[PDB]
Design a protein around this ligand. Structure first.
Ligand SMILES: COC(=O)C1=C(C)NC(C)=C([N+](=O)[O-])[C@H]1c1ccccc1C(F)(F)F
Lengths: 48, 50, 48, 48, 50, 49, 100
C-alpha cells in the first residue's frame, strides 16, 4: 500500500515465512523516527 | 474475522461457481522458470503461486 | 614498526579472555524456549 | 619513453572497469555481458 | 456479515452504517436468518469503505 | 453412495512438529467429484451404460 | 531446484508443442500459456512469430519476488500476445493475482 488512503483495514503477516501460518494485523501509516521533514529533525537525524 | 481465533480467508472471485460463469473452459500450461537466478526468495514464491 | 608492541599486547589479551570465556561459558547457550511439542523457537516480534 | 607508461595505465584502467561491470549471479547462471567480458579477459591477458 | 451484532458495540466506520437484523430461526436453512434484506460479505484483506 | 465428506486424495501426512498452536490454515474448497464408475463396482457392461 | 541458464526459446518451443497435441482429450477453448519468472533480457521475438503468428495463444508473464532483473522484455511479451502482466512480490500478493 503506497498512499495513506490505501493503508486501511487488515493484512496478513506470515510467521516463519510459511504461507500456511498467518495472522491478522491492522495496517497503519507510519513515519520514520528520524526524518528530514523540518530542519530541526534533520539535524537530529544527522547527529545520529 | 476476529471474534473467534479462526479467521476466514474467503474470496468470491476465488469460488468455483464464480469462476465457471466468469469465463469459458481453458487449456492452460504453466511454465516455470528454473534458472539459477530464481533460487532464493523468488523460487520460494513460485511454488506457492503455481 | 612503532605499533607492533601494541599489536602483540592486543593479541595476548584476546587469548586471555577467549580462554577464560571458554572455561566459564562453554556449552551454556544451548537452550531456547520452544513451542510445546514442536521444533519452533518462540520469540516476541522484535525479540531475537 | 613517455607513452608506453600511459597506454598500460589506461589498459589497466580498462581491466578495472571490466571487473567492476561484471554481475555476479547465483547457481551457475549468466547474462550476455558476463560472456563478452570473459572474452575481453583474453585481450588484457595477452597485452600484459 | 462477520461483524459483532451486539448492540452496544457501535463502531460506525465512515461512509457506512450497519443494520442490526432480527434473525428468525428457519428450516431449509439450518441457521438463523433474516428475510428483510441481504447480507454482505467483504473479504478480510479488502478494506470496506474504499 | 455419494456422501457429504469431501473426496480424498492420497494418504494424509501432517507434521505435528511444525504446526503452530494458533494460526488456522485453510480447511478445504474442493468439489465433491465422485464418478459413476467409482460410486459403484465397475464392469465393462457399465462403462457401456 | 533452481540451476542453470535461462532459455526462453526452448521454454516456449516446448510450450507450443504441448499446446498442439490434438491426440489427447482436450478442452480446445482458451489456449493460454503463463510463465513465472523474475527478469528477462531476451524477448524471444522469433518463437512468437510462427508458433502464434495470428495470436491464437495468450501469454501471461509473472514477475515474482523482490529483484533487480529487467522486466521490460516480459512486459513486452505480455503486450504482444494479448495477455497481461502481474507482479508478485509477497505471499499476500499471490492470492489476488493468480485469480485475476
Ligand atoms: C554542533 O555539532 C554537532 O552537532 C555534532 C554532530 C552532529 N555529531 C556529534 C557526534 C558531535 N558531538 O557532540 O560530539 C558534534 C560534533 C561532531 C563532529 C565534530 C565536532 C562536534 C562538536 F559539536 F563537538 F563540535
Amino acid at each position: 500500500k503506497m498512499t495513506e488512503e490505501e493503508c486501511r483495514g487488515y493484512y496478513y503477516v506470515y510467521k516463519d515465512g510459511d504461507p500456511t501460518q498467518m495472522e491478522l494485523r491492522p495496517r497503519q501509516w507510519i513515519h520514520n523516527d528520524f526524518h528530514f521533514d523540518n530542519v530541526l529533525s534533520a539535524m537530529m537525524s544527522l547527529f545520529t | 474475522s476476529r471474534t473467534p481465533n479462526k479467521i476466514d480467508l474467503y474470496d468470491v472471485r476465488r469460488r468455483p461457481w464464480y469462476i465457471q460463469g466468469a469465463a469459458s473452459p481453458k487449456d492452460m500450461l504453466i511454465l516455470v522458470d528454473v534458472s539459477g537466478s530464481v533460487s532464493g526468495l523468488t523460487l520460494k514464491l513460485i511454488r506457492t503461486s503455481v | 614498526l612503532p605499533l607492533f608492541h601494541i599489536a602483540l599486547l592486543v593479541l595476548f589479551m584476546v587469548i586471555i579472555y577467549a580462554i577464560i570465556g571458554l572455561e566459564l561459558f562453554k556449552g551454556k547457550m544451548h537452550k531456547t524456549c520452544y513451542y510445546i511439542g514442536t521444533d519452533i523457537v518462540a520469540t516476541v516480534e522484535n525479540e531475537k | 619513453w613517455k607513452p608506453f607508461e600511459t597506454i598500460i595505465l589506461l589498459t589497466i584502467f580498462a581491466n578495472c572497469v571490466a571487473l567492476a561491470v561484471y554481475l555476479p549471479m547465483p547457481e551457475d547462471d549468466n547474462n550476455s555481458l558476463n560472456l563478452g567480458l570473459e572474452k575481453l579477459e583474453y585481450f588484457f591477458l595477452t597485452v600484459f | 456479515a462477520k461483524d459483532d451484532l451486539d448492540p452496544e458495540k457501535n463502531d460506525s466506520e465512515p461512509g457506512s452504517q450497519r443494520i442490526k437484523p432480527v434473525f428468525i430461526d428457519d428450516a431449509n436453512f439450518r441457521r438463523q436468518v433474516s428475510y428483510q434484506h441481504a447480507a454482505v460479505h467483504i473479504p478480510t484483506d479488502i478494506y470496506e469503505g474504499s | 453412495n455419494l456422501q457429504p465428506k469431501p473426496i480424498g486424495v492420497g494418504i494424509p501426512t501432517i507434521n505435528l512438529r511444525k504446526r503452530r498452536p494458533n494460526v488456522q490454515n485453510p480447511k478445504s474448497q474442493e468439489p465433491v467429484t465422485l464418478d459413476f464408475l467409482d460410486a459403484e463396482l465397475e464392469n465393462d457392461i457399465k462403462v457401456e451404460i | 531446484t533452481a540451476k542453470g541458464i535461462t532459455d526462453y526459446k526452448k521454454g516456449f518451443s516446448f510450450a507450443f508443442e504441448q499446446l498442439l497435441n490434438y491426440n489427447v482429450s482436450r478442452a480446445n477453448c482458451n489456449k493460454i500459456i503463463m510463465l513465472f519468472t523474475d527478469g528477462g533480457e531476451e524477448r524471444a521475438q522469433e518463437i512468437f512469430a510462427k508458433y502464434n503468428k495470428d495470436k491464437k495463444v495468450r501469454v501471461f508473464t509473472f514477475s515474482v519476488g523482490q529483484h533487480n532483473y529487467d522486466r521490460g522484455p516480459i512486459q513486452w511479451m505480455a503486450c504482444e500476445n494479448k495477455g497481461y502482466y502481474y507482479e508478485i512480490p509477497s505471499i499476500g500478493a499471490i492470492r489476488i493475482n493468480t485469480q485475476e
